[PDB]
């Protein structure tokens, strides 16, 4: 069964609201169907665009006012990531542009196996990332304290697309599905952080060689994989070196979760006092590829789900997972097993007492709702958020054909 406190929420639209009357009609219809809350990307690029610590919350106060007036709860996602920004993308909401003048690009960004630089979110390795998020959370808390009664939960963005991961798969870097993507530790800052991490762990270059079986003559010859595709088949993954690299690669995300979690708790616990959550990506493809098993997950930063989910527990953050609507396939060439992935992550979270919340990866309907229903009831989910509002209600406020199924399968699980 779903958890005793289960509620169904719906993600708001991607595009900035420019017709408030239309959005209000949509909100009324969702409320009339028993929807609990609206989840909302609160874009960093919208709210601190003019300068460091120069805030503009007015659009989101309007947004929150509309949600409140419709009798809905509001679940803000503090979205410290970029939306699109490449020609043809369906949004263009970059990080605040002044950030570029505050630290070195190398320390602030991600670089892939081929040298492609990605700026979808600030690197956890930048000294200024934690400080910037702390200021932003403080500002949110200060500006939205008067909205306490309508905010039941707050989400953090742990990286690209609001997910705690590396920007490992990116169309503008040459990626297309079902590519495993690429490791994202090729900035000098990342390479040096890995060298420093290994020197700290083993104590010297010679002790690193002792652990790895290598014959390096300087720390500067230590690098991330210089060929990611064959990282399993070439003995990389199974090697002491490969395990050290992947563990470290994941540890960067884990420390980041700790930092942003602590900043969120510090700013929110005495103002809102609600559950705070973050999201793990559903990297469901290349799971069972014989030549690169779990290659997509690994490039994204996922080496050990037990340990990663333990960090959620330690940081006292709830876990949102995705792909709840998808079925297992496992066939070449996609090697995609999202339903098994959901079971894996969900089972681990429940074993640890980490509260689960769910989302669909892609717009869905029909059988998608029955799959979501299976997951939320098998694993005692505390919430489900449907992406997105226009898949349930048209601009004029009329239901799509899917609202009925969403209501019958999902909303009906909630106590009103
Ligand atoms: Ca700031
Ligand atoms: Cl946009």
Curated annotation (Swiss-Prot):
Binding, substrate: 41, 81, 89, 279, 284, 322, 360-361, 388
Binding site for Ca(2+): 48, 52, 135
Mutagenesis / variant outcome for changing residue 91 to V: 20-fold decrease in activity
Protein's cellular compartments: Secreted
Region (Beta-amylase): 1-416
Residues the record marks as active site: 163 (proton donor), 359 (proton acceptor)
Disulfide links within the chain: 83-91
Protein task: The precursor protein is proteolytically cleaved to produce multiform beta-amylases and a 48 kDa alpha-amylase after secretion.
Family: In the N-terminal section; belongs to the glycosyl hydrolase 14 family. In the C-terminal section; belongs to the glycosyl hydrolase 13 family.
Name the UniProt record assigns to this protein: Beta/alpha-amylase
Species in which this protein is naturally found: Paenibacillus polymyxa (Bacillus polymyxa)
Positions spanned in the full protein: 36 to 451 of 1196
């Amino acid at each position: 069964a779903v958890a005793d406190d289960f509620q169904a929420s719906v993600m708001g639209p991607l595009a900035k609201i420019n017709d408030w009357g239309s959005f209000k009609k949509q909100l009324q219809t969702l409320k009339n169907n028993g929807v609990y809350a609206i989840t909302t990307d609160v874009w960093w690029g919208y709210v601190e665009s003019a300068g460091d610590n120069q805030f503009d919350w007015s659009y989101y106060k309007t947004y929150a006012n509309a949600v409140k007036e419709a009798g809905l709860k509001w679940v803000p996602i503090i979205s410290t990531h970029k939306c699109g920004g490449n020609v043809g993308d369906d949004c263009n909401i970059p990080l605040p542009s002044w950030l570029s003048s505050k630290g070195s690009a190398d320390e602030m960004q991600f670089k892939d196996e081929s040298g492609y630089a990605n700026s979808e979110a600030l690197s956890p390795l930048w000294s200024g990332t934690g400080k910037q998020y702390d200021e932003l959370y403080a500002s949110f808390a200060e500006n939205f304290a008067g909205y306490k009664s309508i905010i039941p939960k707050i989400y953090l963005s742990g990286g690209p697309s609001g997910e705690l991961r590396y920007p490992s798969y990116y169309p503008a870097a040459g990626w297309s599905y079902p590519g495993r993507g690429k490791f994202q530790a090729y900035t000098e800052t990342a390479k040096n952080a890995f060298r420093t991490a290994m020197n700290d762990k083993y104590g010297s270059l010679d002790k690193i060689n002792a652990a790895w079986g290598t014959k390096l003559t300087s720390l500067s010859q230590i690098n991330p994989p210089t060929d990611g595709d064959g990282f399993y088949t070439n003995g990389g993954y199974n090697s002491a070196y490969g395990k050290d690299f992947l563990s470290w690669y994941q540890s960067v995300l884990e420390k980041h979760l700790g930092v942003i979690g602590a900043a969120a708790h510090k700013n929110f616990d005495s103002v809102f006092g609600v559950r705070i959550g973050a999201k793990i990506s559903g990297l469901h493809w290349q799971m069972n590829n014989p030549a690169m098993p779990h290659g997509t997950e690994q490039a994204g930063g996922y080496y050990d789900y037990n340990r990663l989910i333990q960090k959620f527990k330690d940081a006292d953050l709830d876990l949102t997972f995705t792909c709840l609507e998808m079925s297992d396939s496992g066939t070449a060439p996609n090697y995609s097993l999202p339903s098994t992935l959901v079971d894996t992550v969900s089972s681990i979270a429940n074993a640890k007492g980490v509260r689960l919340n769910g989302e669909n990866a892609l717009p869905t309907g029909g059988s998608g709702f029955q799959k979501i229903e299976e997951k939320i009831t098998k694993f005692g989910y505390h919430g489900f958020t449907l992406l997105r509002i226009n898949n349930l209600v048209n601009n004029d406020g009329s239901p799509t054909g899917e609202l009925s199924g969403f209501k019958q399968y999902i909303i009906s699980k909630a106590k009103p």
